[PDB]
Design an enzyme around this catalytic site. Structure first.
Site, PDB file in Angstrom:
ATOM      1  N   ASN B  74      -3.203  -6.081  41.650  1.00 51.96           N
ATOM      2  CA  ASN B  74      -2.397  -7.282  41.736  1.00 51.96           C
ATOM      3  C   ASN B  74      -2.789  -8.357  40.719  1.00 51.96           C
ATOM      4  O   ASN B  74      -3.730  -8.178  39.962  1.00 51.96           O
ATOM      5  CB  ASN B  74      -2.462  -7.835  43.131  1.00 51.96           C
ATOM      6  N   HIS B 104     -27.522 -12.100  34.537  1.00 53.13           N
ATOM      7  CA  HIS B 104     -28.608 -12.652  33.749  1.00 53.13           C
ATOM      8  C   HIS B 104     -29.888 -12.672  34.560  1.00 53.13           C
ATOM      9  O   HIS B 104     -29.878 -12.389  35.784  1.00 53.13           O
ATOM     10  CB  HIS B 104     -28.255 -14.059  33.275  1.00 53.13           C
ATOM     11  N   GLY B 131      -7.672  -9.216  48.571  1.00 53.79           N
ATOM     12  CA  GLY B 131      -7.562 -10.285  47.563  1.00 53.79           C
ATOM     13  C   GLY B 131      -8.823 -11.122  47.541  1.00 53.79           C
ATOM     14  O   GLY B 131      -9.546 -11.161  48.519  1.00 53.79           O
ATOM     15  N   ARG B 169     -20.816  -6.832  54.909  1.00 51.99           N
ATOM     16  CA  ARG B 169     -21.500  -5.997  55.861  1.00 51.99           C
ATOM     17  C   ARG B 169     -20.509  -5.036  56.458  1.00 51.99           C
ATOM     18  O   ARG B 169     -19.305  -5.317  56.501  1.00 51.99           O
ATOM     19  CB  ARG B 169     -22.183  -6.827  56.929  1.00 51.99           C
TER      20      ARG B 169
END
Ligand SMILES: [Ca+2]
Ligand SMILES: [Ca+2]
Ligand SMILES: [Ca+2]
Ligand SMILES: [Ca+2]
Lengths: 176, 176, 176
Positions: B74, B104, B131, B169
């Protein structure tokens, strides 16, 4: 515009907002590194040396944003810049990060005119901000700190500190 | 570019990054389904049959991204693609999802040159990604798993599994 | 398109989706406040008086979106609008907010054809929605309520209520 940089549809403002709309669009469409950096220096309050802002980048005013030296801002960053946003040197900002200078009153009657209050955001030197982070008003992130991806920062973050979660909580000290 | 696909401002790279800037812009501006799919096949490492990526779509390199068959991505997805991102067949990816191949070092001195380390992301077959999800480096999402909207995935997700929250989880087994 | 506004690659649809692609692109490229508002009134189901939607704005269909009067929608908002999205008067929506009308079945076999189910979203009058919020299907936000930045709203929110966190939980009553 001075009742606003001090944190209260004006003439100046609607011009400055309309200039930024112009330049943003031009920057986000630029295929040329040099020309973007050039256009960005015209959008921003200040854009330092060897510093880099990846398109698309979104903000409202542009001129309230000051960016230091050797800092890199990744793509798709949004900045509600009604109050100054000051970003230091060697800062890394991950993509889709959000800076919200603006906010409103809880009371819905205090909101019908879209009254915004603005408080500045400061990111000190050598800070790494993760992708997808939100930083709300009045927040300072102290030097050499790290904000983990997806955190929401509501309170000031001390220097040499790692923070994460939502709300952000201090995960560990990066002090030597 | 080979010290980088293996997870360490080069010549090749700045060309490949600049090609992607070109094609992205062209894709995100294309009003023609066929021409986008065409341009996208030139941006991506591989884009499978009956597969579909909705604009605007953002990434850095393009050629490190391989997308399988009948998968749908999407709009407004961001992919930091310094390391391979491999997406299988029948995958659904919701809007504004983020893939972060890059990251990083905690230490700020280890960051002054913007040194990035990259670890690949793999999304196996028949996965549904909600989403607004973030997927960080080195993550594999196993086949037939679901990642609920807004999760942040830091560790590998087994197959036939539902995961949600931040950190993600495991919410329940989709095994028969 | 009627099995869909009722919550099940059609002819009508692919035209309406393709019209929206056209208009979105035109709106997000418009440097002219009046012309955007004009184009937006052609994209949206309804766009009220003194109301304002900041570019870039993203959706799929456009015509399922009805926006009331004196409401302001900030930039970079995404709306999966397969089912009606109804937004009242004096509403404020912060940037990068997401409305997901669409979703899918857990079972991966029930997903191979990309079958979407859609349930409408309703935002009543005088609501303030924070930046970066996700609102999923079937959600109503009652009048004069506030949703804090970054929340994910899965269940209906009563009127005169403040909610935050993810999932959103009710933080306090704004009743007089
Ligand atoms: Ca988020
Ligand atoms: Ca402060
Ligand atoms: Ca792994
Ligand atoms: Ca409901």
């Amino acid at each position: 515009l001075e009742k606003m940089l001090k944190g209260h549809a004006s003439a100046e403002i609607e011009a400055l907002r309309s200039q930024a709309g112009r330049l943003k669009l031009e920057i986000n469409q630029s295929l040329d590194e040099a020309e973007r950096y050039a256009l960005q220096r015209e959008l921003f309050g200040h854009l330092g040396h060897k510093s880099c802002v990846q398109p698309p980048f979104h903000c409202e005013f542009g001129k309230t944003i000051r960016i230091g030296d050797h800092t890199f801002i990744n793509m798709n960053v949004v900045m509600l810049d009604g109050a100054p946003i000051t970003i230091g040197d060697h800062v890394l900002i991950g993509p889709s990060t959000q800076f919200y200078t603006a906010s409103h009153s809880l009371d819905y009657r205090r909101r019908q005119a879209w009254e915004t209050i603005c408080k500045p955001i400061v990111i000190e030197d050598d800070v790494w901000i993760g992708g997808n982070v939100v930083i709300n008003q009045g927040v300072t992130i102290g030097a050499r700190s790290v904000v983990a991806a997806n955190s929401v920062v509501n309170q000031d973050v001390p220097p040499d500190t790692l923070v994460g979660g939502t709300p952000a909580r201090i995960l560990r000290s990066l002090k030597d």
